[PDB]
Design a protein around this ligand. Structure first.
Ligand SMILES: O=P(O)(O)O[C@H]1[C@H](OP(=O)(O)O)[C@H](OP(=O)(O)O)[C@H](OP(=O)(O)O)[C@@H](OP(=O)(O)O)[C@H]1OP(=O)(O)O
Ligand SMILES: [Mg+2]
Ligand SMILES: [Mg+2]
Ligand SMILES: [Mg+2]
Ligand SMILES: [Mg+2]
Ligand SMILES: [Mg+2]
Ligand SMILES: [Mg+2]
Ligand SMILES: [Zn+2]
Ligand SMILES: [Zn+2]
Lengths: 295, 100, 267
RNA sequence: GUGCUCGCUUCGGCAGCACAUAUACUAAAAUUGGAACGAUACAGAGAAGAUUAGCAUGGCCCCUGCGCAAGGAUGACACGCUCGUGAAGCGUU
RNA sequence: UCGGCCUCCGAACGGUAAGAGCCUAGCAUGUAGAACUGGUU
């Protein structure tokens, strides 16, 4: 009857490079208990600053305990390792964690894991760090590495949306016209983006990741000999032999300069299919961009 | 509770100092060097030392019972500490004093 | 230590300084306090209550049982409302002198009447019963001023003006009454904004709670002194039956009935 | 910008120097979700006849109060657990 | 041809149950976030 979750009173916000910006010379503001968490509603430490010039004066949304749980940004709410949504990372690696939806059970379980992190080291994205090391399987085909500043771009001038921003360029909000409200990508529930449930950006990137045949290959009719186009004479048989030595034994490693085909064939059919799925427009052998097809 | 902003008037800053025992107040510096044993036998010895025609009859002859106040003596019978309040002498005195 | 809170505010960017006429400051403070009391009304959604302008509180309509029970206030709110009514009276007298409706002798005599007739014009006694010591001293100062004044050709006319002594008395009362008011209003603000701790700090065992807490502690002592001679086994501990045996024993001692259960263990 | 120049050199500007030094939840927003509980209907005041003073106790039950005060119907709510059936373990034949 | 003494002064709780629910106020936000396409028997 005397139970409550303690308050996130700590420094060091764990932020993206994108929301972090481009300036190395950073001026900073910190509120102690100015707002509450957007998810677990603990009174957390607000971090507000200006990363660049054309700015929103960006600030943190959820608590540091929730960010320590989910390894997402405190502002951008996207995963810090890849720049991807946590729905995308949970679909890629492990989606067995979840969260309770009722407020009392959510606050009680949040107090339990807050006690767990307080007894733990402090810098750890909880239990699935041991199972999250197996990355760059497919999610790094579309995971961002660039610091994206168009989402750090400030909010839209609703007065000039109505056509009545008398300030003009003195108004620090954006004097460009807004996006489509009928577009489901514009909805973006913050609790849905936290929970990893039906985020439209995550569904759009999953639909995009279903398009490239980066590991399909297998155009040979039950034959291990896959011909990689785009190789030419730059990729020789030695690069295919060194690639297939990790997968076992190479049944047929060859280079044909007439068709620009790197003929790769492991002794095992599964190893040959794995090498073809690696080299189906997703691997470079001896400086030559390989794209697997029938051989 | 680290977060409460309600202040009772018994929660005010008051009596903030702590007095300590002086050497007149049996300070621990003299408690160590003092031995309480021969203090206790000298004080017990002090307590044991300071523990110590026509003729008529008699005019009062026309009664039936003589000398009835013979064995009447309270002494330490009231001083006997009966630890039973049904038979407590103060309780009996209370009943006769407060009941007519 | 001195610890000047005005310098503490002046160090912050939320407080600046200016130069102002005191009548304008009094009008500002009266308007501010009226807005504070209306805001406290709207915080608890007491829109069927209403403050006048002269800090008079009245229900707009009749109340239910729920609106009757929930609108019960404390001493601090009603007393500071009455204090704001008194300062509104002082500011009103200053304003009607400043418009020239009254004479300066009339403003002094009106301050004399205000300082001598505090409880006859305000409800100090309803929320703090201590203040008629100060009202008695104001009456005594009024009689001393009157009987030093009515000496020659002047009589008991209505124009006697002096206010410095009652000003001294009520402002020395004000520096007395400030921190208790601040702590009560802080507890009010903490219950308003942090909510009410329904459990909170544990209640004292007062006079109405003596026998119940004594029997509760006796029953807890019975439980602690019955759990400890039990050996290994015995599923039917029957502590409710032991409580019934003890209650029947105490009731039969109250009734002077010979209580005996021959099936009962000896210790 | 102002102040000053062994100025450029006209007496204007320019050039140099000097000091001047990083306002702001930035919205006059757009939108976003909870909502007093008034109304109506619903609704029925503890202690085994009625009339019922009450203090408790409990916890994810709260209100009013400045409460370590007192009220809110005692504020509300807060009983049902002695034989066969077999099982396995060990001891005897 | 002779001395003086002057307590006090009022408010709440405690009675016009409690519960319940539906539409309605008051009031809380001024947010975070939109990544789209190419190599061979
Ligand atoms: O001097 P007055 O004009 O004759 O009135 C005063 C005084 O009234 P004001 O303060 O308005 O002058 C008192 O009235 P309130 O203060 O109570 O309103 C009242 O008697 P108290 O002083 O005993 O309260 C009164 O009548 P009374 O002569 O019978 O005493 C008399 O008092 P003064 O004796 O001081 O003149
Ligand atoms: Mg009955
Ligand atoms: Mg009572
Ligand atoms: Mg009560
Ligand atoms: Mg009752
Ligand atoms: Mg009662
Ligand atoms: Mg109750
Ligand atoms: Zn970020
Ligand atoms: Zn949180």
């Amino acid at each position: 009857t005397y139970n409550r979750q303690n308050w996130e009173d700590a420094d060091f916000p764990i932020l993206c490079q994108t929301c972090l910006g481009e300036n190395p010379y950073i001026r900073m503001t910190k509120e102690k208990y100015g707002k509450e968490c957007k998810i677990c509603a603990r009174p957390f430490t607000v971090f507000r600053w200006c990363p660049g010039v054309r700015m929103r004066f960006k600030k943190t949304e959820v608590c540091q305990t929730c960010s320590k749980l989910k390894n997402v940004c405190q502002t951008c709410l996207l995963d810090l390792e890849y720049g991807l949504p946590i729905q995308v990372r949970d679909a890629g690696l492990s989606f067995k964690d979840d969260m309770p939806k009722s407020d009392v059970n959510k606050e009680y379980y949040t107090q339990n894991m807050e006690r767990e992190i307080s007894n733990s080291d402090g810098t750890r994205p909880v239990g699935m760090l041991g199972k999250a090391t197996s990355t760059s399987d497919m999610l790094l085909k579309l995971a961002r590495t660039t610091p994206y500043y168009k989402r750090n771009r400030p909010h839209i001038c609703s007065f000039w949306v109505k056509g009545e921003c008398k300030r003009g360029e003195e108004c620090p909000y954006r004097h460009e016209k807004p996006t489509d409200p009928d577009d489901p990508l514009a909805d973006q529930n913050i609790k849905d983006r936290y929970y990893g449930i039906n985020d439209p950006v995550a569904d759009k990137l999953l639909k995009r990741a279903s398009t490239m045949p980066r590991l399909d290959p297998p155009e040979d009719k039950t034959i291990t000999t896959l011909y990689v186009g785009g190789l030419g004479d730059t990729i020789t048989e030695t690069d295919l032999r060194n690639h297939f030595y990790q997968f076992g034994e190479i049944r047929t490693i060859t280079v044909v300069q007439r068709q620009q085909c790197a003929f790769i064939q492991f002794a095992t059919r599964q190893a040959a299919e794995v090498a073809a799925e690696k080299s189906f427009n997703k691997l470079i052998v001896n400086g030559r961009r390989l794209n697997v097809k029938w051989g | 509770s680290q977060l409460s902003k309600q202040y009772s008037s018994r929660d005010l800053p008051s009596h903030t100092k702590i007095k300590y025992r002086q050497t007149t107040q049996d300070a621990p510096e003299e408690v160590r060097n003092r031995d309480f044993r021969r203090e206790l036998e000298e004080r017990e010895r002090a307590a044991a030392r300071e523990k110590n025609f026509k003729v008529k009859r008699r005019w009062d002859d026309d009664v039936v019972f003589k000398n009835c106040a013979k064995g009447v003596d309270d002494q330490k019978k009231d001083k006997r500490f009966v630890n039973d309040t049904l038979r407590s002498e103060f309780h009996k005195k209370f009943m006769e004093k407060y009941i007519k | 230590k001195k610890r000047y809170l005005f310098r503490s505010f002046k160090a912050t960017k939320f407080f600046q300084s200016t130069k102002l006429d005191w009548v304008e400051v009094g009008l500002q403070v009266c308007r501010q306090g009226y807005n504070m009391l209306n805001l406290l009304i709207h915080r608890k959604n007491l829109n069927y209550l209403h403050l006048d302008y002269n800090f008079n509180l009245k229900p707009v309509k009749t109340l239910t049982t729920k609106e009757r029970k929930k609108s019960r206030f404390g001493n601090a709110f009603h007393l500071c409302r009455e204090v704001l009514r008194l300062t509104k009276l002082v500011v009103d007298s200053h304003v009607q002198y400043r418009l020239g409706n009254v004479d300066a002798f009339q403003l002094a005599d009106g301050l004399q009447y205000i300082f001598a007739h505090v409880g006859q014009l305000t409800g100090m006694y309803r929320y703090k019963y201590k203040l008629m010591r100060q009202i008695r001293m104001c009456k005594d100062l009024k009689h001393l001023i009157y009987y030093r004044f009515n000496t020659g050709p002047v009589g008991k006319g209505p124009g006697c003006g002096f206010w410095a002594a009652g000003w001294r008395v009520w402002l020395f009362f004000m520096r007395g009454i400030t921190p208790l008011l601040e702590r009560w209003l802080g507890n009010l603000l903490a219950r308003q904004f942090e909510g009410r701790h329904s459990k909170g700090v544990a209640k004292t065992v007062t006079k109405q709670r003596v026998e119940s807490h004594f029997d509760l502690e006796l029953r807890a002592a019975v439980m602690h002194d019955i759990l400890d001679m039990m050996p290994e086994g015995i599923k039917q501990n029957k502590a409710r039956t032991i409580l019934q045996h003890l209650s029947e024993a105490w009731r039969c001692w109250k009734a002077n009935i010979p209580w005996k259960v021959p099936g009962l263990p000896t210790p």
